[PDB]
Structures are given as structure tokens and as C-alpha cells.
Symmetry: C3
Amino acid sequence: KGKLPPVYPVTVPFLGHIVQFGKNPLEFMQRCKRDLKSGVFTISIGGQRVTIVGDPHEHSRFFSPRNEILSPREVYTIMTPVFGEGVAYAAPYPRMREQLNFLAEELTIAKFQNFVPAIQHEVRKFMAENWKEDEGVINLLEDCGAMIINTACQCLFGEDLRKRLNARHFAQLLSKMESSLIPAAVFMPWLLRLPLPQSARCREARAELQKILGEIIVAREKETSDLLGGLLKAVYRDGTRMSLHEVCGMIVAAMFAGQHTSTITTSWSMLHLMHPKNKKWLDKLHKEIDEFPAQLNYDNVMDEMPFAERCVRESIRRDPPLLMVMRMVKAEVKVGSYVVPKGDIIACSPLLSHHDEEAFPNPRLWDPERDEKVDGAFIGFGAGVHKCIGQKFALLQVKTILATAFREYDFQLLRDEVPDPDYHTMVVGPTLNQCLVKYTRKK
Amino acid sequence: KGKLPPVYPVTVPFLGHIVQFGKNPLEFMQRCKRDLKSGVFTISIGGQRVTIVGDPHEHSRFFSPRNEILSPREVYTIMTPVFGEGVAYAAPYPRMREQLNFLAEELTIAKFQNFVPAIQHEVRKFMAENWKEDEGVINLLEDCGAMIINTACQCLFGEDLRKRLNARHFAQLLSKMESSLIPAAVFMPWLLRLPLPQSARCREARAELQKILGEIIVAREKETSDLLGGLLKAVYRDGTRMSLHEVCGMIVAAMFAGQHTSTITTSWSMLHLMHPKNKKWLDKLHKEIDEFPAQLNYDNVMDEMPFAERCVRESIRRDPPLLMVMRMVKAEVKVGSYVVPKGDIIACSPLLSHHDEEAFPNPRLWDPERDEKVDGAFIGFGAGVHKCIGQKFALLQVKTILATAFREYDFQLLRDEVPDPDYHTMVVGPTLNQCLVKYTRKK
Amino acid sequence: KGKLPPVYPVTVPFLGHIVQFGKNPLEFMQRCKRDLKSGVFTISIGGQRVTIVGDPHEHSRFFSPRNEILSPREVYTIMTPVFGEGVAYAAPYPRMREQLNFLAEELTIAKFQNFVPAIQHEVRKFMAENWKEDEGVINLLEDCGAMIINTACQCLFGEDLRKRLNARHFAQLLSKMESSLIPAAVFMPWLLRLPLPQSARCREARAELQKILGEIIVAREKETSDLLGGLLKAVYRDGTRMSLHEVCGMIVAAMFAGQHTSTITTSWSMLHLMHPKNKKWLDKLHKEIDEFPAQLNYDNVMDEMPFAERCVRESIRRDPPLLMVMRMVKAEVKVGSYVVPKGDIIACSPLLSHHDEEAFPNPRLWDPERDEKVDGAFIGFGAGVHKCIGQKFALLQVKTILATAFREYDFQLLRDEVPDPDYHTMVVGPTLNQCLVKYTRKK
Ligand SMILES: O=C(N[C@H](Cc1c[nH]c2ccccc12)C(=O)Nc1ccncc1)c1ccc(N2CCN(c3ccc(F)c(F)c3)CC2)cc1F
Ligand SMILES: O=C(N[C@H](Cc1c[nH]c2ccccc12)C(=O)Nc1ccncc1)c1ccc(N2CCN(c3ccc(F)c(F)c3)CC2)cc1F
Ligand SMILES: O=C(N[C@H](Cc1c[nH]c2ccccc12)C(=O)Nc1ccncc1)c1ccc(N2CCN(c3ccc(F)c(F)c3)CC2)cc1F
Ligand code: HEM
Ligand code: HEM
Ligand code: HEM
């Protein structure tokens, strides 16, 4: 029964704050911060109070609590049709933890034996089919997209599986599923209690994939180290296995999670590096990768490439593909001198934290050699219990593609300045039609 | 199980693409076309995938299929309260076909015996009451509106009927009904499953009209070639008549369909013709109509006026009053090298087809003497099974009003360039407040 | 069965007219007026016809009818969770009248014995804690906010009550409640039939306040002229008392009603008065208040300050904090030469009436010495049966704060022109971040 955060007073147009959030979210949240003179503050959306933790020193309040107190279940009901009932966020809180952890186990550094070669293998194959000429023009964003999905499938899926479901069909399933979503319904929980037609189409689409996975398992058992096999070998505390229904859901979530995020990180990283005023940084990277043979390996990429890590990390720092991390308060919580009541939605913003000037002096500058001036202010992958569990995989895959690509080609951007981000989409990246790039096959 | 069309990635603001569609729909769909490099493509609206057939060579894919495969029922649930249950699109697919065809029968060239005189009669009466002076100022769009409703009622309704329900009351019923609609709910099928208050008001409004029609029928049977009479004489395959409930619905649909479309076509046609840089075309039309007596007839208007037809047709070509034709895919369908999955909404756009530069070189120019450079690219009235069944009537009425009006008055537009279209409305026409025109009674 | 008002034709974007109403509502409604050439007219919002009475000569049509004919119940279902079921607008029409009247009784001039001293007392205390220096910078809008809530609580609540619930907790309850609202759902009655989570949080919040009130009553009865006591002494026609549930609801409605309105009136009044080109008016006010002692009283403020009244009234005239008064037509009603059908929403607009140039010549000028050129055109507090019942209290409190403040400090605005209104909010006032003001403690 203490002090509530200050409240931006309710506005009339229905969900109108989302339109501002989709146009310039940074200025928007910065105004909120200035006007009410508080890093912690509250806006109302569709009659849903949303409290934004906008002070980087307070990050621990947000990321520390357990799922029974700050819960993501209620904020991600949109996903239940694409992932499936009883799966991840639509799963009881214990079963949910074990599930997320099983997937995390499958993506530990300890599991990446063949990955870097499988990945180099795919990138080379891709560059050979589409970058055939001595020079040519491409959309970098679309091509990274292709590479990420193709590389992920080589790593994670066995030969038998890929033969039944290639990456291009997989990419279509993921796209169809995305397109069926209503992101703004995060603020319309009443909508999601109603029958949606496209909820049912997507469950049929996911039952087709489940069928495939089942046929494969039966085949394997006639004649189990890929993701599918790993997950089927998993055991809960009570000594039971995951259903194939749960496994199919986890695999979809895994690929869905990485489709846009990894893609966008690669694109930005490349875009900054090929930019003239960053020549200096491009040379620094050439030195680092020239120092290696051609066929790379785990150690090279993960252990022996600290400057690549910086470039990638700084790209996420400048343009976090996920603008906002959110939770449903199931029991009230302190934050600075305030309390945040149960039922509120509580939110923390990588975009905002990453442009705080105490935290990142001259935030608009991309500088791979900078460091946070506030500890924990970088939250591109979050922090705490809920920190990204595909971070190490995401980074392997991005670092490898960088290293393979820049070794074999020069890249020229076909406009003066680096692309504007497009804040209209769920996952934020560079504007598609500003991503035109001319490759040049190297001597 | 083939290739899906490329998908514009989902955006956050709720139904935000509609706001762009209501501001500059042409640029919007053109961007979609450029960015994804495909004439066929997909956007998501309110979680509803909408596939746009944007390549004029593919028109046959869209317009060929039968109602059991590409259905308009689900896209036009908005209309069920104004037309009535069991009527047109709210009717089982067989009964629906017969109904639409009965109405089509009543509007065949074979049925237009007295129409041109009845129409001249009304236009003269109108010009005498409101264009009394030697010169004066008017809103062309409002006055065409009046003329279209008055002329339609003379043609279609008998004396007894019109005495009980004049055109000005009829125009009010149509307006009240329109105003009760939620066009954007095409993308909110969940909304239309909920009780709407204004659904019930409109059914009471339509029961008042039904009562009137019934009283008239009883009167006629004491003392049947108008639309009301024709339709009551109709027989289904199974040998039964339409209910009066179905007939009342058909009559409303008929008048509703033409209220704005015909009006807008007339207005544009006049606006282009009275424009100075089109003098040449105005003279061409004067020659064509001077060549006739004063009391016109069917042959004169429909058979002996090919240049009027061109001017009208080109006006629809430049500014199709219906931007978009849509269907619900009930079973998947090929389109070019793509397949379009069941549950998608499939759409084809006269606005887009009519501004394709292969199809209509310099699309922005109004030129009555042009021709399509792609066969079937003109779709102002659609094509195939679902082609407009009031096309011949619409055109009779527009051609006649042109011929009667320009014979008796000169017209001057009170601003430099022709009016901008206003894309905000369901039916698109010229901006109301740019439609100021000065008439001058001729010598 | 007469003439309907003309209808602005339906637009596509969902509730898109609200976005225009939240950007420039005056231009919006003025366009509607010009374009259709009628003071009375109709727009459609979310499929809900809304008829605007925009001609000041017709005000009596709107404000005369009884609650059984023009009802506010259906337009204010948004408030039912914050005020409570069975209370005010969620109450049967007889019980509703008696309730509103009981509250009106408690705010008659006859009840304001200690009020002016209690109020001076609070304003002095406030100026001493926050305006401590010889000079300093403040947000006038936030500080009036504080003063209004603190002064209201001194007047209306006894010592025992205030000790259990101070104004700062009270202000938080009011804010939390506001933030839970969906103003645009005035046009989505279907939404309010669905379970909203934040409906339930707010009822728990109001049950906590009810508990407090009950504990206090029990305490008082051990050891009844404040608002709480007055209302508990009230008797309905049938000889029963209000429940404590109804009393708690009335008290919340009372404080909610005044939080923003009174605040905004004070702010504007001060902002205009401290503006240089209004020096003349500032001096006129100084003369009026210098003519009094320091400890003021009822007569001084209400009877002996006619120029303060003018300044306040003109501020409401220029910027009515409530843009629009609305009602649900339960039975059709004449308005000028039109009829307005049952089910329509009928609306009248202080913003519009207050900027009609026949009514207020040069409406954009703030002039405390003007007069209406149309009788009844000023409707800042409405008119007729539903006229504001906190008007006399609102004005006491504003006049007093003006008189106490300007006596003790000079005020300087920190930008050239007076703040723009911000039309985005439910209650409209000056833009927060343009309200920076420098006080100077007087000699
Ligand atoms: O891309 C999104 N989600 C998808 C689907 C998803 C959700 N949760 C997951 C957990 C694990 C795996 C996948 C998911 C996703 O891939 N998220 C994701 C999460 C973690 N790592 C990688 C990717 C996504 C992207 C944006 C988004 N919002 C748009 C902005 N917004 C918002 C929030 C607060 C505000 F104050 C505001 F004005 C707008 C609502 C949240 C909501 C979303 F669900
Ligand atoms: O005027 C409209 N309909 C009305 C009512 C109606 C519907 N179907 C009928 C069949 C027969 C008779 C009447 C009707 C109408 O009069 N339509 C019409 C149809 C055929 N001939 C003449 C007039 C209308 C006008 C526009 C509209 N849309 C607005 C734009 N929109 C849209 C569509 C696709 C997109 F990708 C997008 F971004 C927006 C949704 C469709 C929807 C509509 F129903
Ligand atoms: O502040 C508002 N209400 C609140 C809550 C409330 C409602 N009724 C009451 C009766 C007694 C006490 C409180 C209330 C309020 O405090 N109103 C109020 C009423 C009377 N005296 C002082 C204050 C409020 C403020 C604005 C509003 N609208 C936004 C603009 N709008 C609108 C209306 C017509 C249009 F044509 C349009 F385009 C938009 C919908 C009405 C609706 C609202 F309820
Ligand atoms: C550049 C790529 C990626 C970025 C930027 C990113 C970002 C994030 C962020 C910000 C969070 C929220 C963490 C928190 O709440 O503390 C997160 C969580 C998560 N990410 Fe990612 N992510 C990426 C890739 C992936 C990949 C490839 C996967 C593959 C499975 C994945 C799965 C997850 C999961 C499962 C969670 C949260 C689960 C939980 O609630 O514990 N992410 N990610
Ligand atoms: C200039 C006037 C008009 C224009 C521009 C217009 C345009 C169109 C268009 C584009 C279609 C879609 C056809 C398709 O899907 O292939 C259509 C269908 C239709 N129009 Fe019109 N129309 C006009 C006037 C009228 C009139 C006066 C009526 C009177 C009844 C009418 C009734 C219909 C009907 C019933 C359909 C489609 C029925 C079906 O699904 O088969 N229209 N019209
Ligand atoms: C400057 C301050 C205020 C302004 C500008 C304002 C304005 C208005 C307006 C425009 C109306 C509509 C009246 C009608 O429909 O004829 C009204 C009604 C009302 N106001 Fe206020 N008001 C103010 C302060 C207050 C206060 C302090 C209260 C405290 C209780 C209050 C309670 C009400 C109530 C209960 C109604 C209408 C009840 C009914 O339907 O009869 N208002 N006010």
C-alpha cells in the first residue's frame, strides 16, 4: 500500500499509443520519461495499465523475480495457437520450466560439435547458387534470412528429417504462422477468448508437421542426436518423457525465435562493417579472420574471435531486434521508490536502455570498442532467469556467417547512410528496400 | 503443398494497414509489389492473411472459380443485417445463385422498355426544380446522387409504389443502413458473432419497408411489371416462389448497390468532360448527341452512342468506385507459380489493375480513346461468374443523364484541376467539397 | 417518420474518426458542418450513428428531455466498474435521480460554511512546502492538480477520515481508476459485455475504500457533517437510506468528476492572467482582491468577486475541459427541421458552440469582458436537468485559489504564447510540458 508510479493520463483513440510505438518508439518513451520526470512510469493501453521500468539501475527488479510473480504466460497468449496448448507458455508453471530447460540443454556450447562446418558448408552452397558472378546486386536482408534458416536446419536437423522437410518449406510454415498473429492483442486479452478462424488453420498446419516428425521417428526406430532426438530423450522430474506434441511445439518455437532476430543481427552487423566510415573496423575484422584457415571450427569462432563478438554485440546494442520485454505482475513488487500493483503489465525496454546516455555515451554512434557505463544496461538477450537460451547458438551462426562471407566478398551499400530501422514490425530490423547491396567476389 | 506467395511481415498497430489503404491505397499496394518483387502477395490484417492478385495476366485465376471454392459469403457478413437473413450472401449457395439470377433477369436490356423516357422525364423535372436560373452554383456530386435515386425509382417502381415510398425516403433508408456498417469488420469476423445494437435497428427499419411492399401487393391484387412484380413472379428450380422477405431484400440490395457507384461514375464523367483541356472530347460528345432528337430512346442511348460509352468507361478506368474485389478461399487454388491456401482471403484490385503501366500506358491520363494493352485488365464491373449484374442498367442511366444534361447546360468547374479522389469511404469517389460547379443554361 | 439529418458517409479505418477528434476536433466538426451544410448532422463511428447538434439556437432540444427519452446510462457504461453497480448511471432511472440529487444537496451554497478558510488554509500550506523560495520554477498544471485534490479533501472530509485516507492516496486511487478506462468503448458497447480483467481489479480497489469508510462510521458511532455523514443521513422517497456501497460510489464520482476539470480551469485561468498582453486584466483582478482582507470568506469569494468569475468563465469558454455532451436516444426527437431516430447517439459540443462566431465574435480571443451573442450558447457546465451539480463548488475552489495565489506571488510563463490544448485526453487541458512557470514571492 505504497506509492504508485506516475501515470500518463488516458488517451481517447483506441490503442492509439501503439501507432506511436510503431513510428518512433524511442521518442515516445523518452517523452513519457521527461514529462512525468520518472524513469519508472505507467501508460494505459486498451484499458491495460503498462508500467515501464525505464531506469537502467533498476534492471534487477525486473529480471530477478520468479514466474509465479512476474509471469510471461498472460502476455504471450498470442502464441498458443502456433506453439500449441500445453507447450511453453501455455503450460503449467513447473512443466513450463522443464520444457524451456530441455531446449536450453540442446543449445549448450557442449552440443555444437559439427555446427561450424555444417554452417560454413551451407553458406558456401548459398553463395555459389546466388552470388555466382564476379559482382552482383542483392537484398542483404532477404539473403541473410535464407542463410539463417538453411544453416539452422543443417545444425539442428538430421539428414532424414531435412529430406522430408526442407528449409524452404520450413521457412513457409514459420511465415504463415507469423502472419496469423495479432501482436496488439497483447492488450486485448478479451479478443483471445473468442474463436478466431486463423487459430484453427494454424493448428492444422502444425498437426501436418507433427505427422512428419512421427513418421520419421518410426523410421529411425526400424533402421537420435539431432534436436528432435535429443528432446525425445528428455525426462521430467516425475520420470516421464515429453509428448511428441510438446516436442513438435518446442522445435517450432526454436526456429520461430531465431528466424528474424538472427537474421536482423547479421544484416546490421554486415551493414555497419561495409560502411566507408567504418573501414577501420572492417580491417580489424579482416586481420582477425585472415589469422585462420579456411575450414573453421568451434574454438576459432567462439573462443578466438573477440572483435567479431564486439561488432555483433554493438549492432544489437544500437538496434535491438526486440524492443521490449514484458511480464504480467501476479503479485505486487517494489521498483525504486515505487510499487507496481498486481494486474499491471510490467515492461522493460532494450531500445530505451540501449539509448540512455549515462549508459551508452553517444548512443547513436555504432562503436564496437565501447563499453556500458552502467552495469547490466545491455539487455539485448535479457538477463536473469528468463535470459535468452538461444544466445550462444544465435551468436555462433552469426559469427560464422560474417567470417565466411567477408573472407570471400567485398560488399558495397547502395545508398549514402546506413538503413533506418523500421519500427512497424513485431521484430525490428532495417528497412527492407534500403538493404540493397553490391557484392564483389574477392581476388 | 507447393509454394506460398511472399508475405509482407506482420505489423503491430491494430488494423493499421487499413489506415494506409484509406490514405493512398495505390502507393500502398505498389510498395507491396515492389518490395517483395511479386504481383501475387500477402499481407496480414487483424490476423487475417489477405492475398492480393496484383498481376493483370492472372485475372482469370481469380474470376474463374465457382462459389463453392472462392466464396463471397464470408467476406460480406457485414451486409446480412441490412439485406436480411436467407438473402443473397446469407443464403445457401444454390438459393443464392437463383436469387442473384432473378434480379439479373429483371435488369436485362430486354426489360428496359420505358426506361430512357422515364429517366429523361426525371432529369428534366430535377433540372427545372434546382437549376431554375440562367446560371447558378451546385454540388455536382450531391445532385447526381439525387438524380440517380430519382431516375432509378421511376424505372423500377410503379406509380402505386412510389406514391407510398418516394425516392427521398428511400434515399434515407439507404443512408441510415450504410451508416450502420463496419467496413473494417471484413477483417473481424469475431465481431460479427457478437450482438450489435444497430444490427437490430436496421432489421426493424427493413421490416417497415416489407410491410409497405406487402400492403401494395394486396392492393394490386384487388384492382406486376415493375421490379417488385417481376420478382414475385419468379420460380426456383424446385417450383417455389421467393418469399416477400427475400424480395424485399433483393430490392434493397439493388438500390444500395447503385446509390454510390452510379452516382460517382456520372460525377467523374461530367467533371472530366467540363474540364478545359478536354474541350476536344466535349465537342466529340456534342456532335454525337446533337445527331439525335430531344425525346431519346433505348436504341439511341445503348446502340447509337459509342463515344459516351468510352467517356464513362474511361472514368471508371481512372477512378474505379470499388477499389477491391474479395473472396474467401474455401479450397486452395493455383495462381501463377504460387498456391493460395484455404482460409486466406483472396483479393483483386481494379484500382491496381487500372494503373498498371503495361496495361494502361500513362494511367494517370483520362483519355476516352485509349484501349487496354492487357486483355481483361479492365475490371470496373469485374468479370466471370460474379460480373456486375447491374452494369447495363448503371450504364443506361449514366449515359442518359449525360446526354440530357450536356444538351441543356454548360458546366464550369470552380477550381483549376479535377477533384482528388477521397479514399476514406467504402465507395470511392471525388472529394465532396471540391465538386463545386457553375451551370449555365444554354441558348 | 420525417426527415433524417444528413449523414457523413461511412469511412473504412476502424474508429478512425476518433483519431481526428483527438488531433483537431474543432476543424473536424467544422468540416462536417460546412460540407453537409447543416448545423445538425450525423457521423458513423464503429457502426454507431452519432448525431451532433451543432447549432447553438437548438440547444434546448438537446438539454430539455427527461432521462427516459435521452439517456446517459448507455453512453457511460465505461464508468460502471469504477463507480460500482447500482450507482449513478448503473442505477434504475428513479434511484439514479435521487442519488444524483442527494449529492447535489451536499454541494449547495448553503453547505459551504467553513470551506473558504479550509481552502485558504490548504493553499497556504502547499505554497509553503513547494514555493519556499523567493523565486522558483514549477509545473502549474501538476501543482493546481495537487491543490484541487488537497482543498477538496479539507472541505469534504472530516479529520478522522483524512487521517485514514490522505489526499495523496486518494489521488492515486483516482488515477489508477482513470487509467483502467477505455474511452473509445463508448462506441463499442459489445466490448463492455465481455469480461475485462481490469474491471475486477478496480472493484477490489473500491472495496478497499468501502472498508475504510465502514470502519470510520463505526468509530464515529462509538465516540456526520462531512460529505460522508451528509450522504448517510439521506432518505429516498420510499423511506430507506443509501447503502454504504452507494455512498462510497457517490464519493468516488464526486472526486473523480472534479480531479481534472477544476484543475484545468484553474491552470488556464492563471495562464491567461499571467500573460503580458493581459496585464490590464491582471490589474483589474488585483484591484478586486486588494479590496479584501487576508483571511477570506464565502461572501467575499462568491458574492463580492464578479471579475474573477468572468476570467474563470471565459477560460472555460475558450477551452471547455469537456468537449462533448452525449446521450442515447431512447425515443425519437425533433431537432430543427429534422428528426433523430431511436438508437442514435445524440451529442452536443461545448467546444463547437463556444467557437461559433455569431455566438462568440472572435472566439480565439480570451476576453473576460465579452458576452454571449446567442442565449444559452455557453454550455461549459451544460444546461437543464443534467446541468453540472458541482459547478458552485468547482467555482468556489477555483476562485479562492486564484485569489490566494495572485495575492502572494507573481507568475511568469516560460514561453512566448499560451499553451496549446492537448486534445488527446478524455478531459482536455493545456499541454503538460508547455505549462512551465516561474513564481516570484511578492513584497
Ligand atoms: O516477436 C515476438 N514474439 C515472437 C514469438 C515469441 C513470443 N515469446 C516467445 C518466447 C520464446 C520464443 C518465441 C517467442 C519471438 O520470436 N520472440 C522472441 C522471443 C525470444 N527470443 C527470440 C524471439 C514479439 C515481438 C514484439 C511484440 N510486441 C510488439 C511491441 N509491443 C509493445 C509492448 C509494450 C509497449 F508498451 C508498447 F507500446 C508496445 C507488444 C510487444 C510481441 C511479440 F510477441
Ligand atoms: O460498398 C461496399 N459494399 C456495398 C454493399 C455490398 C457488398 N456486397 C454486395 C453485393 C451486391 C450488392 C451490394 C453489395 C456495395 O454497394 N457494393 C457493391 C457491390 C457490387 N456492385 C455495386 C456495389 C463495400 C465497399 C468497400 C469495401 N471494402 C473497403 C476496402 N477493403 C479492403 C479490402 C482489401 C484490402 F486488402 C484492404 F486493405 C481494404 C475492404 C473492402 C467493402 C464493401 F462491402
Ligand atoms: O471525463 C470523462 N468522464 C469522466 C467520468 C464520468 C462520466 N460521466 C460522469 C458523470 C458524473 C461524474 C463523472 C462522470 C468525468 O469526470 N466526467 C465529468 C462529467 C461531469 N462533470 C465533470 C466530469 C469523459 C471524457 C471524455 C469522453 N469522451 C471522449 C470524446 N468522445 C467523443 C464523443 C463524441 C464524438 F462524436 C467523438 F468523435 C468523440 C467520447 C466522449 C467521455 C468521458 F466519459
Ligand atoms: C539475436 C537473436 C536473439 C535475440 C536478440 C533474442 C533476444 C531475447 C530476449 C531479449 C529475451 C528475453 C529474455 C528475458 O526475459 O530475460 C529472449 C528470451 C528467449 N529467447 Fe531469445 N533472442 C534471440 C535468439 C533466440 C534463439 C535462436 C532462440 C532459440 C530457441 C531463442 C529463444 C529464446 C527463449 C526460449 C527465450 C526466453 C525463454 C524464457 O522465458 O526463459 N532466442 N531472447
Ligand atoms: C457503376 C456502377 C457499378 C459498378 C462500378 C459496379 C461494380 C461491380 C463490381 C466490381 C462487381 C464485382 C463483380 C465480380 O466479382 O466479378 C460487381 C458485382 C455486382 N454488382 Fe455491381 N457495380 C455497379 C452497379 C451495380 C448496380 C446498379 C447493381 C444493381 C443491382 C449492382 C449489383 C451488383 C451485383 C449483384 C454484383 C455481384 C453479384 C455476384 O456475386 O454475382 N451493381 N459490381
Ligand atoms: C470545472 C469543473 C467542471 C466542469 C467544467 C463540469 C462540466 C460538466 C458538464 C458539461 C456536465 C454535463 C451537464 C449536462 O448534461 O447538462 C456536467 C455534469 C455533471 N457534473 Fe460536472 N463539471 C465540473 C465539475 C464537477 C464537479 C466538481 C462535480 C462534482 C460532483 C461534477 C459533477 C457533475 C455531475 C454529477 C454531472 C451530471 C449529472 C447529471 O447527469 O445530472 N462536476 N459537468
